[PDB]
Design a protein around this nucleic acid. Sequence first.
RNA 1: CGUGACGGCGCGAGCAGGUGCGAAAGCAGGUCAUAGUGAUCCGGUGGUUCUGAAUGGAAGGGCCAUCGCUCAACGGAUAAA
RNA 2: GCGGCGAGCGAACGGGGAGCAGCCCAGAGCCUGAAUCAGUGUGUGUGUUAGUGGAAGCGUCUGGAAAGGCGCGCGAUACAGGGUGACAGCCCCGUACACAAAAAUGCACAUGCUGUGAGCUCGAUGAGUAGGGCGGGACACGUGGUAUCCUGUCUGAAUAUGGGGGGACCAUCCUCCAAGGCUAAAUACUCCUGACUGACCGAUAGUGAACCAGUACCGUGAGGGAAAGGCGAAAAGAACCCCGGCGAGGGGAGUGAAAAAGAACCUGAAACCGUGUACGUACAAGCAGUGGGAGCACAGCUGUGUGACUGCGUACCUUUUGUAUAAUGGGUCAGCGACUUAUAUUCUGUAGCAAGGUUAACCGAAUAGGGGAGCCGAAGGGAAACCGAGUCUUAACUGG
Lengths: 201, 64, 117, 144
Amino acid sequence: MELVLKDAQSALTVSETTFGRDFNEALVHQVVVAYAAGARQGTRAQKTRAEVTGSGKKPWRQKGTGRARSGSIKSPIWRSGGVTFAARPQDHSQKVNKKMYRGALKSILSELVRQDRLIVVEKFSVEAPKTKLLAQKLKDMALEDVLIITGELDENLFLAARNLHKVDVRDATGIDPVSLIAFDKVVMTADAVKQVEEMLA
Amino acid sequence: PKIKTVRGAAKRFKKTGKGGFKHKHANLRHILTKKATKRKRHLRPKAMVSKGDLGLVIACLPYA
Amino acid sequence: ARVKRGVIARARHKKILKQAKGYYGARSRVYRVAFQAVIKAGQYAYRDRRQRKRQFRQLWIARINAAARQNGISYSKFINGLKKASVEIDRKILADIAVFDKVAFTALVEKAKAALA
Amino acid sequence: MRLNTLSPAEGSKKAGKRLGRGIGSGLGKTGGRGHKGQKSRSGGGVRRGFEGGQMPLYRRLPKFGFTSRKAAITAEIRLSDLAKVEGGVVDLNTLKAANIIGIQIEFAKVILAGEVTTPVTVRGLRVTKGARAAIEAAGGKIEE
RNA sequence: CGUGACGGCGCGAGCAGGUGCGAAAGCAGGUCAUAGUGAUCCGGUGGUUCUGAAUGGAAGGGCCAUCGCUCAACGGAUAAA
RNA sequence: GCGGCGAGCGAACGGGGAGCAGCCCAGAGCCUGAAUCAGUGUGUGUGUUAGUGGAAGCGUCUGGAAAGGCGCGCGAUACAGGGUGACAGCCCCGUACACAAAAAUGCACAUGCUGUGAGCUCGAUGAGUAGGGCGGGACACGUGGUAUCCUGUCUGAAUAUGGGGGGACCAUCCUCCAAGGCUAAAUACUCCUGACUGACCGAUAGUGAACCAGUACCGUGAGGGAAAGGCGAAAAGAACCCCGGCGAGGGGAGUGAAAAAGAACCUGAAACCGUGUACGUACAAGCAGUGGGAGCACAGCUGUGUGACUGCGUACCUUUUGUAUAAUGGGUCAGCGACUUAUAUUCUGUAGCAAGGUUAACCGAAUAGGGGAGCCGAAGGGAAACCGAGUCUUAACUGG
Ligand SMILES: [K+]
Ligand SMILES: [K+]
Ligand SMILES: [K+]
Ligand SMILES: [K+]
Ligand SMILES: [K+]
Ligand SMILES: [K+]
Ligand SMILES: [K+]
Ligand SMILES: [K+]
Ligand SMILES: [K+]
Ligand SMILES: [K+]
Ligand SMILES: [K+]
Ligand SMILES: [K+]
Ligand SMILES: [K+]
Ligand SMILES: [K+]
Ligand SMILES: [K+]
Ligand SMILES: [K+]
Ligand SMILES: [K+]
Ligand SMILES: [K+]
Ligand SMILES: [K+]
Ligand SMILES: [Mg+2]
Ligand SMILES: [Mg+2]
Ligand SMILES: [Mg+2]
Ligand SMILES: [Mg+2]
Ligand SMILES: [Mg+2]
Ligand SMILES: [Mg+2]
Ligand SMILES: [Mg+2]
Ligand SMILES: [Mg+2]
Ligand SMILES: [Mg+2]
Ligand SMILES: [Mg+2]
Ligand SMILES: [Mg+2]
Ligand SMILES: [Mg+2]
Ligand SMILES: [Mg+2]
Ligand SMILES: [Mg+2]
Ligand SMILES: [Mg+2]
Ligand SMILES: [Mg+2]
Ligand SMILES: [Mg+2]
Ligand SMILES: [Mg+2]
Ligand SMILES: [Mg+2]
Ligand SMILES: [Mg+2]
Ligand SMILES: [Mg+2]
Ligand SMILES: [Mg+2]
Ligand SMILES: [Mg+2]
Ligand SMILES: [Mg+2]
Ligand SMILES: [Mg+2]
Ligand SMILES: [Mg+2]
Ligand SMILES: [Mg+2]
Ligand SMILES: [Mg+2]
Ligand SMILES: [Mg+2]
Ligand SMILES: [Mg+2]
Ligand SMILES: [Mg+2]
Ligand SMILES: [Mg+2]
Ligand SMILES: [Mg+2]
Ligand SMILES: [Mg+2]
Ligand SMILES: [Mg+2]
Ligand SMILES: [Mg+2]
Ligand SMILES: [Mg+2]
Ligand SMILES: [Mg+2]
Ligand SMILES: [Mg+2]
Ligand SMILES: [Mg+2]
Ligand SMILES: [Mg+2]
Ligand SMILES: [Mg+2]
Ligand SMILES: [Mg+2]
Ligand SMILES: [Mg+2]
Ligand SMILES: [Mg+2]
Ligand SMILES: [Mg+2]
Ligand SMILES: [Mg+2]
Ligand SMILES: [Mg+2]
Ligand SMILES: [Mg+2]
Ligand SMILES: [Mg+2]
Ligand SMILES: [Mg+2]
Ligand SMILES: [Mg+2]
């Protein structure tokens, strides 16, 4: 399989199993959903009837008063009472099998190629850490909302992209499934392509 | 937490190849003189747990 | 994710109370009572779609009887005569003619009498 | 392929039962518990093996047997495991190094299960009659 | 094969070994049949090509035979009301 | 394994990780002040306790007001966040980034001063103790065949040619050296301080307490314990006039985008209570509706309102063999109020891989990658030794 470079006007040979496989939507959906579950903090609580502040005194005697029977001022039936099934902090993360994570990545990258959203370049860099330079470079290549995957994290490039909210810059080892789907285009350097190929076997 | 085995059940049932359970017959501990040899001989080999009882045994033996 | 019930609860109660307009007292004002009244009105309406077909046939038959006896024949003999004459007009139409076209109804009675003779 | 165009496989996400939410749901009021009795109560139900008070099955039957400590340190080896060791000599140590038997196994027996197609030397293990035939027929040998 | 929710209980030709009676064909795995009974646990006694916590033994355990309950509220809550 | 062998209780060996560190007295001689820690001064760094600078926007439309629409520009290592008369990268405060300490103080070095002793040699090697009898307790281990540990009571060794342990006990072998002591790190927690975050709450929720709340109030006392948030962008919080008791309250005027935003103040639901209009209703018997239906009013034959007269018709929930039941529960409205969460296990669906599948802690800056310690599966039979596509039974199976 040949990926056509855009800045050098050549070709690059990649594995068909990484970049030319079918889209497994059911597999990609599970991995994307697990990624968002992994981002949850899960920090909350309410108070059960045991934790509401108050005394254990029976509000009134069992029989004779003509009122419904009461046992605790903290009953969840009562205003100011406990929460019946009060929440505790939770860990929402899911397990993803190693082979399912990698399988989903290969499905996503292959679909990016079919939809013409993967752009391979020989080099992508800026001379100075200036946002204005990267904005001009992206305007020249008709890009606006783009994920940029480099082999080595150029320090000038990373700084130049910080204040551009539609633009992200990563190294090949830091790609994630949600980012590959979320950006309009994905720009990879030839060097990053090899690293991703080797990473996904 | 982990389910706890009913330890008394583990001492009386063993799981067989297709997933049933073998057990030892009752009535062969004592009061043996008045029992016929034929009756005692047929109580010596192990037997399988019947269909109605499998649900009770499986509940007691989650790690069998 | 706490969910407050007010907006949805208000819409449900209002939907029932709107169906209870015209009812007496708490039946048009108070949700607990209006709900029971709306259900009972629905039960009656189901029952009375069936009753309506009975009551109207009963009315048509009574009017055919009166018009037939004005022409000298009972309802039961009139219906038998029409059936022997192969006339398939139904009671809704026979009752309509009995009121609005007494001359045509007389002609039907004569047809029934001839088939019986 | 966007974050708002991905769908799960059909049949993979069945909705959970929600008891006690009205007539139309089919689980309103009693929530599938029936009427009254111990099993309808919060926290209700009898323990495992309870039969109502009749001597239960796991107590009217007798205990039998004993548990052998030697069985816990004995293992069985398949013929298909013989090619998995490193070096063509199969013994207790090389089986442990290849993760075929546990670290505390002291006795192992090779049985006729699967196939061996390469010559191997088995040393210090017991071998069944059928496995010895298959090993030697494949060009190997057994050393006591 | 019968009969039981189950635990169980019952009837059984025939096979191996060894036996009694009969000249022999044969009959005999108690009694004309259907009541005469008590699960499990815990232990006792004898046997045993099983086990034996470094090793050889041993103790203890297993297996086979057998013993101890008007647990009679007789499927037997406790050793003890 | 323990266990009225019931309910239940529940290891270790061994393996993978985090972290890692060893020393002294029971004593003399030599050699000496040598290691090492503690203290106290002094330096150098590095924090903490105030702070400094910090980019870039105008025109026009709607509007009470522009940050919004439309047009054309500009900054960005700064598009974190907050404010400003509606939603602001460029109005304001910040933010990225770059700097700052007279004085006090933390830390890590360095270097003084004080104490401490380092090394070699030769010795020494913790007695009312170990062990035992009796009674208890602790060990996963309930006295059991019960090792081991602690000791209230009564006793009582050997002491290196010696002693402890290896789960009753003995022999053999192996291993260790009690009856003196010190020791960082990996571990536990948060009254308190700073920063940041949330598929956490948003005034009956969230702290009991968003508000002068552990208050008011209750109790002899210990103690118990509330309710109660929102005018507007800005008070511009209504000069003056009128009725009234120099009232309360109101009507004007004025402010304001708005005063049914006027302080009993955003929105302003429902129960409940009124005024006005249309139709019905004083000869008529009951769950009050429903089916039929005249007349009247209204708006454009129809739509809306009303409903004379007439067929049928004993609420709901619960509990029950069965309820109009004179059985239960509800005065009404609004708000809240009940199958959850964690872990283990089995079955179904679905996805991955497949005779294999998958990692845990942990490492890692990493939702990657590493980590296969393990767990499940590909073999069973037998109480077990053991045998193994067979095995058990039995002296042996025609067998089972
Ligand atoms: K409440
Ligand atoms: K960015
Ligand atoms: K059910
Ligand atoms: K041992
Ligand atoms: K009884
Ligand atoms: K702003
Ligand atoms: K003991
Ligand atoms: K309180
Ligand atoms: K409160
Ligand atoms: K207003
Ligand atoms: K009001
Ligand atoms: K009526
Ligand atoms: K009720
Ligand atoms: K009742
Ligand atoms: K009753
Ligand atoms: K009553
Ligand atoms: K499950
Ligand atoms: K599955
Ligand atoms: K067989
Ligand atoms: Mg009390
Ligand atoms: Mg609360
Ligand atoms: Mg991983
Ligand atoms: Mg016995
Ligand atoms: Mg909310
Ligand atoms: Mg409702
Ligand atoms: Mg009302
Ligand atoms: Mg109303
Ligand atoms: Mg149902
Ligand atoms: Mg029931
Ligand atoms: Mg009920
Ligand atoms: Mg019942
Ligand atoms: Mg309860
Ligand atoms: Mg392993
Ligand atoms: Mg006789
Ligand atoms: Mg007899
Ligand atoms: Mg006992
Ligand atoms: Mg024995
Ligand atoms: Mg031994
Ligand atoms: Mg009984
Ligand atoms: Mg500035
Ligand atoms: Mg503008
Ligand atoms: Mg506004
Ligand atoms: Mg010593
Ligand atoms: Mg000792
Ligand atoms: Mg002692
Ligand atoms: Mg002792
Ligand atoms: Mg003692
Ligand atoms: Mg002593
Ligand atoms: Mg010992
Ligand atoms: Mg031993
Ligand atoms: Mg509150
Ligand atoms: Mg509110
Ligand atoms: Mg007081
Ligand atoms: Mg005034
Ligand atoms: Mg407002
Ligand atoms: Mg208001
Ligand atoms: Mg109102
Ligand atoms: Mg009269
Ligand atoms: Mg009248
Ligand atoms: Mg009346
Ligand atoms: Mg009636
Ligand atoms: Mg009754
Ligand atoms: Mg009735
Ligand atoms: Mg009654
Ligand atoms: Mg009544
Ligand atoms: Mg009633
Ligand atoms: Mg009730
Ligand atoms: Mg009652
Ligand atoms: Mg009652
Ligand atoms: Mg009542
Ligand atoms: Mg096996």
